[PDB]
Design a binder for this molecule. Structure first.
Ligand SMILES: Nc1nc2c(ncn2[C@@H]2O[C@H](COP(=O)(O)OP(=O)(O)OP(=O)(O)O)[C@@H](O)[C@H]2O)c(=O)[nH]1
Ligand SMILES: Nc1ncnc2c1ncn2[C@@H]1O[C@H](COP(=O)(O)OP(=O)(O)CP(=O)(O)O)[C@@H](O)[C@H]1O
Ligand SMILES: Nc1nc2c(ncn2[C@@H]2O[C@H](COP(=O)(O)OP(=O)(O)O)[C@@H](O)[C@H]2O)c(=O)[nH]1
Ligand SMILES: [Ca+2]
Ligand SMILES: [Ca+2]
Ligand SMILES: [Mg+2]
Ligand SMILES: [Mg+2]
Ligand SMILES: [Mg+2]
Lengths: 424, 437, 308, 56
């Protein structure tokens, strides 16, 4: 059950690069690709993310995509840059200019076929391909514009494969350009149609966690990506180690997505205060895991209801106390869980904890409060589109105002759809 | 001697099968390498245990079983397990990608690809039988393979073996060990399509087995290994009459005759006792009256329900150990005057008793302690319908919103089958209603 | 923080119980169809007992005993007394009754009818079901039925003076999850102001028995009442006990008695969902929480325990 | 009570104790192969509509 990883754009590659550094450490793979672990649990499902090349080395099944060489050059020279397959570095020279149109219609078009050739070369080698996972942002041009283009074409060639993404949402707090709401609204429509699972990672939430919780006065992208690495490692634990709950991408989608369009999850991590010597008790993990302060989407869970929830505990701990602590959370706040989906909370436990922690808990929530994120992007979108401001950047690439009206309309539908089940 | 073929489908069916055949070998004295020293007839057998084991010229006793799973990981553990030498490769059938807890995926999409292979492999063992009685099908309700592919196999078996009997050992879904939210969907889907093809089905609620392990075995967080070792005991005493000399439940046809007066109502309740922890320093061995009385305690039933608020259609008592008929009738006499046991008007109030002198066998190093006498009651009580109501209610809660339905339509199924299955369960609940009051 | 649901809005008694629970600060009321509850104030008909006791980590309690209707339905109550050996024909506290289906003990009912027809004894009966007709001729009451029940009519009831009135006694009994039988220390007499709010409590009725009959309510009546309550509940105990069940039950019962001129107590019927007297709602409803609820769900006597 | 049909042997024995007397077609392979192929058609059609949507 192989997974094909793709990271596109500046954000997608910087986050994707850190992700491979976290799990490579967990699986005992050095920057050279040589395994140096001390537990067979590190290698039992190593094939999900790593290809075993000649010499008993492990090559990440990762494709590095970007319309600029800059960020990818940093990855190639970064800590684990050497471990990535050289041929899998597919990049252009022009860039995308934080423009969804350039990444999806013009610049990205030139390069997309080159990426699909590498994807095809990886898929053909897989014994049983689960699907793909994409790391990217939605505020830029390459990861947002070209990322969604890749997904549309990947789905056309692999329609019976699971499409999973880690999508960073733009926020004025951590903003590069004013056109970020435009790019995000355009991308969300693609994701609503061509993905099965999307982890909504809000840069606003990441910033607040660094500022309020981690006590970081001047948060950087490196500090935000630290949280994303820890979260990405958690949500994929059940995929990278032996287990029975949500062990693959499809069974995860079957437990988490009751309606095809409502597949946007709120990730959470605990202990949040990461980047410390006293480990937490099982009751403490459960409490923080469900605490909105540990949510990565910047949505108040109490403003909605949980359709489905997937918990993942890591470390040597009392499974009994875990079971009774999970039951305590549900029976203590049962009103926040829809009563028309019985037993919508599934819990998994993994022996191997993350690096630096003796115990941790990862949270994956499909809450109707996620609409707060889309409603927020929609308001920022309409604020500019109502005056057609900054549209010339996009009409200059062949886009018509109509396509913006449709995207705006599609997301408001998504919001209303989330509002439907929050009242049923 | 008439042979019986066992079929284990999905993870639950395969792992439970692995626990049962381990217990069979221990009871019959068959070594992991297939040899059976106590067997003097080499290469040929007309004995009671030959209904479950075939014999080779080399003296190996091969189970008349076939394992099938749409995923290779579970059956691979059997290919490399302690009893690898027991099965031959043709008996272990595995796919590449499983049903993802999706009934439609296991019945239509993936099931259609492997259905002819499994039937062909089953035909291999059938041709090696002189008088095949039928099949014993082990599977889960919640799994996509156990639910989806089993209903397709049960259909085909009725087409290729219309005369043979088919018995089920079904694992009822319990959230404490559940792996999918849509297990209520799969349970009702597989019951609707399998109902007309199963002659007698023994349901096992993981909730009941789970709690029994916590209370009677002192296991904080029981695992599948704990559950299956206990489930195999119940299965062993149920099939013991087919593997040993005796006169009660000597063939699969007798199960339907003794426990199922109505075809649709073919879900007998199973109660087992005693379940003693092997960790206890010493325990006072229970008597015939004590273990028999425990058969009417819901805390010992394979499905939690209150038989007092229902009516019986048939009862069978299966004793293994130091038990004589005199002690049984004495226990039955006192129990009648101190318990609510109401039969249906057209059925006689009585008990078909069976006693095998060999005490129950326990896996060395397991959790169950060795006892001097044990009993397994098979009672066809309308009270078991409580389990149907539970499932159907969860089904109604989700289906009202169409939650998760798209996963099934996307595999080729139609919403109509959802309503059909539910309507069939609605009829099944009424059947229990009128028979029960 | 315990949770509970309310599935019977017409329950005047448990409408007060659910009020006290919330007012304790340790009970949260959920939606009536929310499964993650500790206590259910279930509906009066078709309570889903089959779905109780299947929530991991939830000790679930319900305010009804499944199978108790056998004692509360007049038709089944007669069958219980005439069939159960514990009661049988030896019990001298139940009026001679027969079950008659409206087109069955009709043939046997007439057998004893001719016995009193032959004799000069009173032959007045009453016909009722779960609209009543009191008639001396068996034909007038049978035509009224067309399932009902016909039983002997107490022709010599104890009359309260002054007034020459007729009355009946209502006793509230509580049975907890352990099957302790708690008889509410307070009772009420429902009187007919017409010669043979109409509520006479025990304090007054007791004084009358002392000033009029030179006896006490305890000796002349309450002993037999406690005997009848104990006998009825101890007979059906094996059928409804939740001692080793995955869910626990309790229930408040309403026993109605009759006292004849000989100071003999008779059982009329049992009510599985009775209503308390306005003056006694507070004290009793508080006792339900103390004995039946807090005993199972602890927090941060008005009853008479009937031993057995 | 009443004990009847008592059968004994070396392995054990069986019988039946009575306490009270009583108060007193499967689808063909064609039809199966038909529905299995009907489901595969609905899949191919749904997939064709997706590939038609992506072509647009
Ligand atoms: N008693 C018992 N139950 C099991 C066991 N394994 C799985 N189950 C139950 O089976 C249900 C899930 O079905 P599975 O058998 O695992 O699924 P499957 O048959 O392999 O089919 P797929 O969906 O394709 O994986 C869950 O409710 C489990 O509780 C087992 O070993 N023993
Ligand atoms: N066998 C009998 N002998 C004498 N009087 C009787 C009788 N049966 C009933 N009665 C009279 O009939 C009246 C009503 O009887 P019953 O108790 O059945 O009414 P009910 O069930 O409708 C109201 P509740 O819910 O309080 O029981 C009583 O007050 C009693 O005086
Ligand atoms: N969390 C995180 N967000 C980033 C990072 N880099 C850029 N972003 C966000 O992504 C958006 C910019 O898109 P970007 O990926 O840089 O453009 P692209 O190269 O065309 O994909 C802005 O909203 C940024 O807030 C990063 O390293 N970490
Ligand atoms: Ca032999
Ligand atoms: Ca048949
Ligand atoms: Mg940038
Ligand atoms: Mg499986
Ligand atoms: Mg009444």
């Amino acid at each position: 059950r192989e997974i094909v990883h793709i990271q596109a754009g500046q954000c997608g590659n910087q986050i994707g690069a850190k992700f491979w550094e976290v799990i490579s450490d967990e699986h005992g793979i050095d920057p050279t690709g040589s395994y140096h672990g001390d537990s067979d649990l590190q290698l039992e499902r190593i094939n999900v993310y790593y290809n075993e090349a000649t010499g008993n080395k492990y090559v990440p099944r990762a494709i590095l995509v970007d319309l600029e060489p800059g960020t990818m050059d940093s990855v190639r020279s970064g800590p684990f840059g050497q471990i990535f397959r050289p041929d899998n570095f597919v990049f252009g020279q022009s860039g995308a200019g934080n423009n969804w149109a350039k990444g999806h219609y013009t610049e990205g078009a030139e390069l997309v076929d080159s990426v699909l050739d590498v994807v095809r070369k990886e898929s053909e080698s897989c014994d049983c391909l689960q699907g793909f996972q994409l790391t990217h942002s939605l505020g830029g041009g390459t990861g947002s514009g070209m990322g969604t283009l890749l997904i549309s074409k990947i789905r056309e060639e692999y329609p019976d494969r699971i499409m999973n993404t880690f999508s960073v949402m733009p926020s004025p707090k951590v903003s590069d350009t004013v056109v970020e709401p435009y790019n995000a609204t355009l991308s969300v429509h693609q994701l609503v149609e061509n993905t099965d699972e999307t982890y909504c990672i809000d840069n606003e939430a990441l910033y607040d966690i660094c500022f309020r919780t981690l006590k970081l006065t001047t948060p950087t992208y490196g500090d935000l990506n630290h949280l994303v690495s820890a979260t990405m490692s958690g949500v994929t634990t059940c995929l990278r180690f032996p287990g029975q709950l949500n062990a693959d991408l499809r069974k995860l989608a079957v437990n988490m997505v009751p309606f095809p369009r409502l597949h946007f999850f709120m990730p959470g991590f605990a202990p949040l205060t990461s980047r410390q010597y006293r480990a937490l008790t099982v009751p403490e993990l459960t409490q923080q895991m469900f605490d909105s302060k540990n949510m990565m989407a910047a949505c108040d869970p109490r403003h909605g209801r949980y359709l489905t929830v997937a918990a993942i505990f890591r470390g040597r701990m009392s499974m009994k106390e875990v079971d009774e602590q999970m039951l305590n959370v549900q029976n203590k706040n049962s009103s926040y869980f829809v009563e028309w989906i019985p037993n919508n909370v599934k819990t998994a436990v993994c022996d191997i904890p993350p690096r630096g922690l003796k115990m941790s808990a990862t949270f994956i929530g499909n809450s109707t409060a996620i609409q707060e994120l889309f409603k927020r992007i929609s308001e920022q979108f309409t604020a500019m589109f109502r005056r057609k401001a900054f549209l010339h950047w996009y009409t200059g690439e062949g886009m018509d105002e109509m396509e913006f009206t449709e995207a705006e309309s599609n997301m408001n539908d998504l919001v209303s759809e989330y509002q439907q089940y929050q009242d049923a | 001697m008439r042979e019986c073929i066992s079929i284990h489908v999905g993870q639950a069916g395969v792992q439970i099968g692995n626990a049962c055949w381990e217990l069979y070998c221990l009871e019959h004295g068959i070594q992991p390498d297939g040899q059976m020293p106590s067997d003097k007839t080499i290469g040929g057998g007309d004995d009671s245990f030959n209904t479950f084991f075939s014999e080779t010229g080399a003296g190996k006793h091969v189970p008349r079983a076939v394992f099938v799973d749409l995923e290779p990981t579970v059956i691979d553990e059997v290919r490399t397990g302690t009893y690898r030498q027991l099965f031959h490769p043709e008996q272990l059938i595995t796919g590449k990608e499983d049903a993802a807890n999706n009934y439609a995926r296991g019945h239509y999409t993936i099931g259609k690809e492997i259905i002819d292979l499994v039937l062909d492999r089953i035909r291999k063992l059938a041709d090696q039988c002189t008088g095949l009685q039928g099949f014993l099908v082990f599977h889960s309700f919640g799994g996509g393979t156990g639910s989806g592919f089993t209903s397709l196999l049960m259909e085909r078996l009725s087409v290729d073996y219309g005369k043979k009997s088919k018995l089920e050992f079904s694992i009822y879904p319990a959230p404490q060990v559940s792996t999918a939210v849509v297990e209520p969907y799969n349970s009702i889907l597989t019951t609707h399509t399998t109902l007309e093809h199963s002659d007698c089905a023994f349901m096992v609620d993981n909730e009941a087995i789970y709690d029994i392990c916590r209370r009677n075995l002192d296991i904080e967080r029981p695992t599948y290994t704990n559950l299956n070792r206990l489930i195999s005991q119940i299965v062993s005493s149920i099939t013991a009459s087919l593997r040993f000399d005796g006169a009660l439940n000597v063939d699969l046809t007798e199960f339907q005759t003794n426990l199922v007066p109505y075809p649709r109502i073919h879900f007998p309740l199973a109660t087992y006792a005693p379940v003693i922890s092997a960790e206890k320093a010493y325990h006072e061995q229970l008597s015939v009256a004590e273990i028999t009385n425990a058969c009417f305690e819901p805390a010992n039933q394979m499905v939690k329900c209150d038989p007092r608020h229902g009516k019986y259609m048939a009862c069978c008592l299966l004793y293994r150990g130091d038990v004589v008929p005199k002690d049984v009738n004495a226990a039955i006499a006192t129990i009648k005057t101190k318990r609510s046991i109401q039969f249906v008007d057209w059925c006689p109030t009585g008990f078909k008793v069976g006693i095998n002198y060999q005490p129950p066998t326990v896996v060395p190093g397991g959790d169950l302690a060795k006892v001097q006498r044990a009993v397994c009651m098979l009672s066809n009580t309308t009270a078991i319908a409580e389990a149907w109501a539970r499932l159907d209610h969860k089904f109604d809660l989700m289906y009202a919103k169409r939650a998760f339905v798209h996963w099934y339509v996307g595999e080729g199924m139609e919403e109509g089958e959802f309503s059909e299955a539910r309507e069939d369960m609605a009829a099944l609940e009424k059947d229990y209603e009128e028979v029960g009051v | 923080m315990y949770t509970f649901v309310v599935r019977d809005e017409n329950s005047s008694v448990y409408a007060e119980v659910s009020r006290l629970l919330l007012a304790t600060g340790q009970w949260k009321r959920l939606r009536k169809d929310n499964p993650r509850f500790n206590l259910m104030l279930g509906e009066r008909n078709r309570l889903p007992f089959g779905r109780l006791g299947h929530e991991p980590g939830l000790v679930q309690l319900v305010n009804y005993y499944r199978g108790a209707d056998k004692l509360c339905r007049k038709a089944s109550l007669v069958k219980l007394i005439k069939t159960s050996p514990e009661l049988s024909e030896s019990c001298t506290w139940f009026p001679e009754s027969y079950v008659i289906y409206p087109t069955d003990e009709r043939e046997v009912f007439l057998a004893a009818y001719n016995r009193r027809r032959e004799g000069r004894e009173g032959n007045v009966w009453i016909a009722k079901s779960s609209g009543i007709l009191i008639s001396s001729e068996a034909s007038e009451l049978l035509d009224f039925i067309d399932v009902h029940v016909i039983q002997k009519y107490l022709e010599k009831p104890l009359l309260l003076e002054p007034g020459h009135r007729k009355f009946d006694i209502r006793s509230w009994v509580l049975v907890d999850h352990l099957y302790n039988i708690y008889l509410y220390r307070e009772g009420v007499l429902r009187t007919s102001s017409e010669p043979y709010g109409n509520e006479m409590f025990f304090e007054e009725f007791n004084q009358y028995l002392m000033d009029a009959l030179n006896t006490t309510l305890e000796n002349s009546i309450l002993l037999q009442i406690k005997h009848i309550i104990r006998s009825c509940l101890m007979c059906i105990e094996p059928a409804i006990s939740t001692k080793h069940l995955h869910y626990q039950s309790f229930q408040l019962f309403g026993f109605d008695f009759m006292v004849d001129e000989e100071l003999k107590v008779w059982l009329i019927e049992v009510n599985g969902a009775p209503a308390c007297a306005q003056k006694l709602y507070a004290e009793l409803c508080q006792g339900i929480v103390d004995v039946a609820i807090s005993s199972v769900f602890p927090l941060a006597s008005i009853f008479i325990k009937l031993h057995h | 009570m009443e004990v009847i049909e008592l059968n004994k042997c070396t392995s054990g024995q069986s019988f039946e104790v009575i306490l009270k007397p009583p108060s007193f077609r499967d689808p063909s392979l064609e039809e199966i192969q038909k529905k299995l192929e009907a489901a595969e058609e609905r899949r191919k059609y749904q997939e064709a509509e997706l590939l038609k949507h992506l072509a647009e």
